[PDB]
Amino acid sequence: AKVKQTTGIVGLDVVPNARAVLIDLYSKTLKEIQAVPEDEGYRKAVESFTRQRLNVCKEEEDWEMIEKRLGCGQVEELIEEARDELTLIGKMIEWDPWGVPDDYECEVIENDAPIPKHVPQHRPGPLPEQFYKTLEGLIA
Amino acid sequence: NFTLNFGPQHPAAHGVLRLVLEMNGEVVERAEPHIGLLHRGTEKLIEYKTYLQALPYFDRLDYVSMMAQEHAYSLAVEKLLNCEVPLRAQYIRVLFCEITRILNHLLALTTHAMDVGALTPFLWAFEEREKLLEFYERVSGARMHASFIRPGGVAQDLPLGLCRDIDSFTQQFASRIDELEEMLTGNRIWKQRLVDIGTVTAQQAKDWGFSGVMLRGSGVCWDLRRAAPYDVYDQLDFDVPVGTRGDCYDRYCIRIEEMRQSLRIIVQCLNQMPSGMIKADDRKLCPPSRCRMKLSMESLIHHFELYTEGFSVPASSTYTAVEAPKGEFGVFLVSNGSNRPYRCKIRAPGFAHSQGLDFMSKHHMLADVVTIIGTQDIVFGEVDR
Amino acid sequence: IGVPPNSANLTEARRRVFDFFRAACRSIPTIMDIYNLQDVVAPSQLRYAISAQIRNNAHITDPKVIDLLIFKGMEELTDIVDHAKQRHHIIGQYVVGGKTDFLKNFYTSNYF
Amino acid sequence: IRRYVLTKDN
Amino acid sequence: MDNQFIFKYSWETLPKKWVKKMERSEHGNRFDTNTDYLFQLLCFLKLHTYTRVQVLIDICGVDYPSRKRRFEVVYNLLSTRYNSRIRVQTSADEVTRISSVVSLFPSAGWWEREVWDMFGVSFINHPDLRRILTDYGFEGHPLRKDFPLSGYVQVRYDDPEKRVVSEPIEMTQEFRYFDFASPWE
Amino acid sequence: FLDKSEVTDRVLSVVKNFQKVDPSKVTPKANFQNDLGLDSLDSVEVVMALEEEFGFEIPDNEADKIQSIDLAVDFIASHPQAK
Amino acid sequence: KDWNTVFERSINTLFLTEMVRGLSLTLKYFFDPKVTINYPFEKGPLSPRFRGEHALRRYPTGEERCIACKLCEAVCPAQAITIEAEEREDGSRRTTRYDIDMTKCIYCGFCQEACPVDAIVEGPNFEFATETHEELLYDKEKLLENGDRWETEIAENLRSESLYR
Amino acid sequence: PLLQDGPPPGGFAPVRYARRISNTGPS
Ligand SMILES: CCCCCCCCCCCC(=O)SCCNC(=O)CCNC(=O)[C@H](O)C(C)(C)COP(=O)(O)O
Ligand code: SF4
Ligand code: SF4
């Protein structure tokens, strides 16, 4: 309930208001992704997760609850993701890479050679449900 | 502003350090490190050696943490070979990697404190360094450059009394660390010469490629032994110390805690080490016993083929990184299917840390530049291969 | 500052060659002072040396190769401007300098 | 190895 | 988070005209792209929410003398947030200038200087592209396959000249190359 | 402002040091690259020699404009720095 | 803050109470047994696996064990070994030249573990510093002298690691 | 052989690894 004393990260400072700096960045992201063509994989994912996070930031007033339900970093690590997605949208718009070439071809190699168990392997835990919901949205 | 040169040729600071500093007054404005004086062409020499013949090059990369580089090279070769390692060999490798981590931290802390002006802890720490290098001399025949960790299993087995002697060492290393801390931690001069010098934000550490203590001092809880565990590190209990201010003092408290936790891991490895064989049973990749080569024909053929041609790694390429004492040590090994590596880049943490000296020292006192260099724990064997 | 983008035609390559030559010529006074070349070489013999290098590398018609040559020459010039190279090195590179050739080579060794 | 090649596919 | 998820996500979200080769294996998920889309791909992969790759581990070159585009430049990337590694590769010959990524990753400067020193690949918009490892005035790029192991020049002290001088190399014992290759491979 | 006398001599003197320039042809009006059959390298070398016999500088946008020694000597005579 | 805490931490600031605690620690080590050894008289502990000066061994009958298989010259990562061989008058496969560059040697022990007849071994000797570069170019005679001079210790060590190698 | 280096039966004795406090001084 109380304001966050420290974020635990050097350079990252606690933002006194995080439900008002995120509800605005998400609104800007949703109002600026419109320039991307509708049938592009980027727009669908960036307009799916930005809608869910925007709804979550609208439902619950306290930052602790927002941290709990999203479960992906602190509210001070979500502002720095929204501000980077906003920059990425502009860079996509000015570059305009949306044109699929007529002579496009991609070699999708699929190797299956196993690796040992003691070998260092990056094994993360299950991602939040949205990372899969956006995925089914993209495939569909 | 004038253009000043620190070349310390004397190993009171590294030995091949060459900084060209632009000082306005007493503050330094830009620190350009001139590297290349210890560039011995190691990366090109690897391509002319057999996979077994190129193992000793990794001892001489980070000559303060020897087993750390061999572990990474062996793991890369195993990954490209799909070679399974027995549990006892894995426990031995973890044990001698955590001994190596303690050795590196003990050298780093006191060679950094000697730069400040504290001469007493240096000899005290080198006493325990000699005690630990005695164990290096027991399993192998070399005090420093021990070709002990090898791609298949481990080179050879442990002597009879090694476990007892290591336990006896661990019974007093805690008090040794306590004395070393009590000489430096509470001292006001040590605090005044380290606190708020070298502050790095987490974003800066991520952008500049910082790893290990340099990264974990900024609040980033990123340990490669817990994020991408290797060997039996996921069966051992140890904490990951994380800093709060990012200055040189946090890098020192974390460098203490990482060595206490290394002692803890060593104790667990001693207690849980099982019995069995120390090498993979695929003698197509591992040497036969000296009693089997002199008695069996196929064992002698395997010995002859392994000690001239060696094994052949299937054509592939991968990047394997381990948690070296300095930070993330990675090997990018490329194989074309022959008995010699096609390409082997060595990703040294010191290369990414000495590169960031420019922004860490900017607008700092001239005497505060040696503390910034010593807190990164740089050795130039790895900086310029 | 940054490495310039790769050229698209021979005219841009020629412009870059001229710019590099002018920069090298303006760098001549600095070398005569950093290294004791005052009572060693005329201020025009070196200029002729750079001109000779540009002229004997003047048969290239590939703009990329010309740009790479210019970049290497600029790197060499920057190294010489600094005290990086030894004194005799530039004096060993940047100074302008009978029976039969076959018979002398024969008298020298079998490996021509 | 499953080295199938993607195409525009209209 | 994982090789199975990153591959499928980047298949959909990424623009198709950038990547032309996508291997998904246990040795590493690689992306092979043209040299004129490298900066765009690495900027996308540094800012996107689900592909927050904020660490450039290293930049290495690989020499393939048998290929038309001789050099292969590999970008090993790391994502601390999602605990995943991505590798991006391009190809360039000896006279092409590929784009520099120091704007995105400040640590790319020394690795790009090392790549230029070792292989001769030049980077566009690099603040300072000079040799970082080889000796001053070094001629040739040692990490090329056609560069001799011992080099072309050797260093000795010349007493009459009163300085350390460079001379053509002359080995007292030449490097003995042992051919252990087997015909039954 | 400088008189034409000495500025004419200072440009009629240095041009004869190119081991190919004919002394009989150099005059207040004798184009560098056209009338003397010079190379573009010599076309910039004459300008650089103009700043090699003095300390003033010629911007890169003032070198390729007019390769005529008449306008060159007029510009030299309109150099307040020289004397 | 609290008056008591402020006063207590102010006393420590002015009375140097955290430097006396280090002076006492140093003084305690002052009156303490030393850990230095008289190197000329007493030597530091070693191990039977120590990789020191190289030695060429011979059979107890007096025949040299080296069979000119060149299996140590091909495993040497530093290319410090050069071997020349031919058929001896008896018809046995022996070496005419066996010289090791100790200025190239990295003392890794690969040659010792690759020899199928236990001919080349790294003995316990580590005190062989020379005054000349050519005295470090060991040849067959020098190596055989080393093997003859250190034969008993080498044999005992090889017995020790027979259980492990 | 079957006699291999390892911990004795029952394991090794427990060893401290944390900082030991030192309350020395009258203050
Ligand atoms: C102390 C100073 C240190 C640095 C000194 C310099 C060291 C490197 C020297 C330069 C090395 C090179 O090859 S870099 C320069 C190499 N590039 C070329 O030669 C372009 C091809 N030449 C042509 O196009 C024409 O012949 C042209 C000559 C331009 C004029 O003739 P026109 O206009 O009529 O056409
Ligand atoms: S110890 Fe190693 S480097 Fe020395 S001769 Fe034997 S194999 Fe070669
Ligand atoms: S010393 Fe041993 S390995 Fe070397 S040639 Fe002689 S028998 Fe073979």
XYZ file of N, CA, C and O and ligand atoms in Angstrom, chain C residues 10 13-18 20-21 23-25 27-28 31 46 49-62 65-81 90 94, chain F residues 33 38-42, ligand 1:
255
model
N 32.853 6.273 -59.468
C 34.271 6.617 -59.488
C 34.511 8.085 -59.163
O 35.587 8.437 -58.667
N 34.861 8.405 -55.508
C 36.158 7.852 -55.133
C 37.275 8.853 -55.397
O 38.171 9.033 -54.566
N 37.237 9.520 -56.554
C 38.242 10.532 -56.862
C 38.175 11.694 -55.881
O 39.211 12.218 -55.451
N 36.962 12.118 -55.524
C 36.814 13.199 -54.553
C 37.408 12.807 -53.206
O 38.087 13.610 -52.554
N 37.169 11.567 -52.774
C 37.746 11.105 -51.514
C 39.264 11.011 -51.597
O 39.962 11.321 -50.624
N 39.797 10.584 -52.746
C 41.248 10.545 -52.922
C 41.836 11.942 -52.783
O 42.849 12.144 -52.104
N 41.211 12.927 -53.431
C 41.717 14.295 -53.342
C 41.618 14.835 -51.920
O 42.540 15.508 -51.443
N 41.697 13.090 -49.112
C 42.729 12.430 -48.320
C 44.110 12.986 -48.636
O 44.935 13.171 -47.734
N 44.386 13.247 -49.916
C 45.676 13.811 -50.297
C 45.870 15.188 -49.680
O 46.952 15.509 -49.173
N 44.440 16.311 -46.926
C 44.638 16.133 -45.490
C 46.065 15.693 -45.179
O 46.691 16.198 -44.238
N 46.600 14.759 -45.969
C 47.971 14.307 -45.765
C 48.960 15.445 -45.981
O 49.946 15.575 -45.245
N 48.716 16.277 -46.995
C 49.599 17.413 -47.242
C 49.556 18.412 -46.093
O 50.596 18.945 -45.687
N 49.050 17.555 -43.114
C 49.703 16.882 -42.001
C 51.221 16.938 -42.050
O 51.866 16.541 -41.074
N 51.803 17.411 -43.148
C 53.257 17.464 -43.309
C 53.906 18.357 -42.252
O 54.905 17.937 -41.650
N 54.459 16.533 -38.812
C 55.464 15.475 -38.762
C 56.866 16.061 -38.671
O 57.733 15.515 -37.976
N 58.392 14.695 -49.395
C 57.337 13.860 -48.832
C 56.050 13.991 -49.635
O 55.373 12.991 -49.907
N 56.222 11.969 -52.430
C 56.109 10.554 -52.072
C 54.648 10.109 -52.002
O 54.275 9.063 -52.555
N 53.806 10.888 -51.317
C 52.373 10.570 -51.297
C 51.788 10.623 -52.704
O 50.964 9.778 -53.083
N 52.199 11.611 -53.504
C 51.704 11.668 -54.876
C 52.101 10.424 -55.660
O 51.300 9.901 -56.441
N 53.324 9.933 -55.459
C 53.791 8.749 -56.170
C 53.012 7.510 -55.749
O 52.697 6.650 -56.579
N 52.713 7.388 -54.454
C 51.895 6.263 -54.003
C 50.500 6.316 -54.619
O 49.977 5.304 -55.108
N 49.888 7.501 -54.627
C 48.561 7.637 -55.224
C 48.616 7.307 -56.712
O 47.702 6.681 -57.263
N 49.703 7.700 -57.380
C 49.801 7.497 -58.821
C 50.082 6.045 -59.186
O 49.591 5.565 -60.213
N 50.878 5.330 -58.386
C 51.132 3.936 -58.734
C 50.021 3.031 -58.219
O 49.986 1.843 -58.559
N 49.110 3.567 -57.404
C 47.855 2.888 -57.102
C 46.684 3.445 -57.909
O 45.527 3.299 -57.502
N 46.959 4.069 -59.055
C 45.936 4.779 -59.816
C 45.305 3.944 -60.925
O 44.503 4.483 -61.694
N 45.638 2.661 -61.038
C 45.014 1.810 -62.043
C 43.758 1.112 -61.540
O 43.146 0.352 -62.297
N 43.367 1.350 -60.288
C 42.178 0.717 -59.731
C 40.932 1.402 -60.275
O 40.855 2.636 -60.329
N 39.945 0.599 -60.682
C 38.678 1.121 -61.177
C 37.490 0.666 -60.339
O 36.343 0.938 -60.713
N 37.728 -0.018 -59.219
C 36.650 -0.478 -58.354
C 36.472 0.524 -57.221
O 37.405 0.709 -56.424
N 37.354 -0.826 -53.709
C 38.786 -0.997 -53.495
C 39.452 0.351 -53.251
O 40.342 0.474 -52.400
N 39.031 1.382 -53.985
C 39.584 2.718 -53.781
C 39.257 3.226 -52.382
O 40.108 3.821 -51.710
N 38.020 3.012 -51.925
C 37.643 3.447 -50.584
C 38.446 2.714 -49.518
O 38.872 3.313 -48.524
N 38.658 1.409 -49.703
C 39.467 0.663 -48.743
C 40.912 1.154 -48.739
O 41.538 1.251 -47.675
N 41.455 1.468 -49.917
C 42.806 2.015 -49.995
C 42.894 3.356 -49.278
O 43.861 3.628 -48.557
N 41.886 4.211 -49.470
C 41.858 5.506 -48.795
C 41.791 5.314 -47.287
O 42.454 6.022 -46.523
N 40.973 4.362 -46.836
C 40.835 4.112 -45.405
C 42.149 3.629 -44.803
O 42.555 4.074 -43.723
N 42.835 2.717 -45.496
C 44.124 2.240 -45.002
C 45.159 3.359 -44.988
O 45.954 3.469 -44.044
N 45.168 4.200 -46.025
C 46.078 5.333 -46.035
C 45.799 6.313 -44.913
O 46.722 6.860 -44.309
N 44.518 6.549 -44.618
C 44.159 7.433 -43.515
C 44.576 6.839 -42.178
O 45.020 7.564 -41.281
N 44.429 5.523 -42.019
C 44.900 4.868 -40.802
C 46.407 5.024 -40.648
O 46.907 5.321 -39.555
N 47.148 4.828 -41.741
C 48.597 5.013 -41.705
C 48.958 6.452 -41.349
O 49.873 6.699 -40.555
N 48.244 7.415 -41.936
C 48.507 8.822 -41.655
C 48.235 9.150 -40.194
O 49.006 9.870 -39.554
N 47.133 8.631 -39.649
C 46.814 8.879 -38.248
C 47.855 8.253 -37.329
O 48.229 8.843 -36.309
N 48.334 7.055 -37.673
C 49.387 6.428 -36.879
C 50.669 7.254 -36.918
O 51.338 7.430 -35.893
N 51.029 7.765 -38.097
C 52.252 8.556 -38.224
C 52.119 9.880 -37.479
O 53.087 10.375 -36.889
N 50.922 10.471 -37.488
C 50.700 11.715 -36.754
C 50.973 11.512 -35.270
O 51.642 12.329 -34.627
N 59.375 6.020 -40.857
C 58.924 6.892 -41.937
C 60.090 7.256 -42.849
O 59.936 7.324 -44.074
N 59.318 6.639 -46.479
C 58.828 7.849 -47.128
C 59.947 8.688 -47.737
O 59.813 9.910 -47.842
N 45.485 22.642 -65.682
C 45.179 21.306 -66.178
C 44.942 21.280 -67.682
O 45.125 20.233 -68.314
N 48.238 19.146 -67.500
C 48.537 18.630 -66.175
C 47.487 17.610 -65.739
O 46.427 17.462 -66.350
N 47.803 16.898 -64.664
C 46.892 15.939 -64.065
C 46.129 16.595 -62.914
O 46.547 17.614 -62.360
N 44.982 16.004 -62.566
C 44.179 16.536 -61.470
C 44.959 16.530 -60.160
O 44.775 17.414 -59.313
N 45.839 15.543 -59.979
C 46.726 15.556 -58.822
C 47.629 16.781 -58.849
O 47.836 17.436 -57.824
N 48.160 17.125 -60.024
C 48.907 18.373 -60.144
C 47.990 19.584 -60.021
O 48.419 20.645 -59.550
C 53.103 10.889 -43.838
C 51.737 10.699 -44.491
C 51.174 9.336 -44.098
C 50.119 8.889 -45.108
C 50.699 8.963 -46.517
C 49.785 8.238 -47.500
C 49.943 6.728 -47.338
C 48.949 6.015 -48.253
C 49.082 6.553 -49.675
C 47.759 6.377 -50.415
C 47.530 4.895 -50.697
C 46.512 4.753 -51.825
O 46.739 4.022 -52.726
S 44.960 5.694 -51.776
C 44.565 6.364 -53.418
C 44.335 5.232 -54.415
N 43.165 5.530 -55.220
C 43.314 5.803 -56.637
O 44.391 5.787 -57.128
C 42.095 6.118 -57.500
C 42.378 5.696 -58.940
N 43.110 6.756 -59.611
C 42.428 7.697 -60.481
O 41.259 7.601 -60.657
C 43.218 8.805 -61.177
O 44.337 8.247 -61.808
C 43.679 9.863 -60.172
C 45.000 9.432 -59.540
C 42.630 10.040 -59.076
C 43.882 11.205 -60.874
O 43.712 11.073 -62.257
P 42.453 11.861 -62.972
O 41.790 12.762 -61.960
O 42.962 12.689 -64.127
O 41.446 10.854 -63.476
